[PDB]
Amino acid sequence: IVGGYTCGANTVPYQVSLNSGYHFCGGSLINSQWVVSAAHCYKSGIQVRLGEDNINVVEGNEQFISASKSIVHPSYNSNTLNNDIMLIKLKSAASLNSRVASISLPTSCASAGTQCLISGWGNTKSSGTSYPDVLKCLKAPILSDSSCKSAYPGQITSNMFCAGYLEGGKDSCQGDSGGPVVCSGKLQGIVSWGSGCAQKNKPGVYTKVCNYVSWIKQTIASN
Numbered sequence: 001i002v003g004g005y006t007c008g009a010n011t012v013p014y015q016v017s018l019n020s021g022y023h024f025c026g027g028s029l030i031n032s033q034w035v036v037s038a039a040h041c042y043k044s045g046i047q048v049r050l051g052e053d054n055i056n057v058v059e060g061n062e063q064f065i066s067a068s069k070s071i072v073h074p075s076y077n078s079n080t081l082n083n084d085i086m087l088i089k090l091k092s093a094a095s096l097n098s099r100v101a102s103i104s105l106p107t108s109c110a111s112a113g114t115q116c117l118i119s120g121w122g123n124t125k126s127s128g129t130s131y132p133d134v135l136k137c138l139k140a141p142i143l144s145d146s147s148c149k150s151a152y153p154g155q156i157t158s159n160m161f162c163a164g165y166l167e168g169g170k171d172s173c174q175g176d177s178g179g180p181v182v183c184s185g186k187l188q189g190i191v192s193w194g195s196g197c198a199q200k201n202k203p204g205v206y207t208k209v210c211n212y213v214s215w216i217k218q219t220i221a222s223n
């Protein structure tokens with residue numbers, strides 16, 4: 001996250017770190033046994049780390065649970081990042097509490113200047129490299145479909161939205177991938193991609209979760 005703020009320990013209790021010896025991606029806890037992330041975050045040997053603030057210090061609220069199964073979306077395209085969504089089942093149920101809690105799936109999609117909370121352990125610099133140890137937060141509105149398409153010609157599908165600021169300075173960034181965008185208590189986005197970070201006219205692009213809820217519920221109900 002570039003130009004955001006320190007969230008505060010466990011203030012984003014649905015935020016997960018995906019760990020293959022190091023943090024490589026975010027995710028969102030959607031019930032005691034399931035995480036949603038980006039398909040582009042897929043790899044074997046995932047440990048899900050819940051209850052995390054400092055990803056480099058054991059602070060006392062962590063639950064470390066191995067993935068038993070990963071399900072990349074049937075229609076995921078790695079070239080276009082169309083359908084950039086995957087589900088991860090935990091080998092054991094997370095113990096849900098005030099600091100480890102699932103985030104509601106949407107019943108409807110979000111719209112315009114709906115303010116959203118984007119979070120992750122990604123890079124905090126635009127033209128440098130600094131990875132934070134504690135979770136960073138950005139409040140950002142969803143941008144118009146027309147603005148998003150104008151910003152990224154021939155790249156934005158109906159399964160994508162832009163959120164952030166066309167003036168730049170505030171954005172998601174590398175290592176935020178797969179993390180949440182929460183708008184009025186609902187998981188509406190997954191951190192998907194961008195052109196650099198916090199560049200003018202190049203806001204973050206997000207997986208439109210509302211398109212995927214029937215697939216998420218069907219998949220969870222049969223696995």
Ligand SMILES: Cc1ncc(CO)c(C=O)c1O
Pocket residue numbers: 172173174175176177178191192193194195196197
């Ligand atoms: C610009 C930019 N924005 C977001 C992400 C999230 O992964 C990445 C990397 O995957 C990136 O390069």
Ligand SMILES: [Ca+2]
Pocket residue numbers: 052053054055056057058059062
């Ligand atoms: Ca920790």
Ligand SMILES: [Cl-]
Pocket residue numbers: 124125126127128
């Ligand atoms: Cl910078």
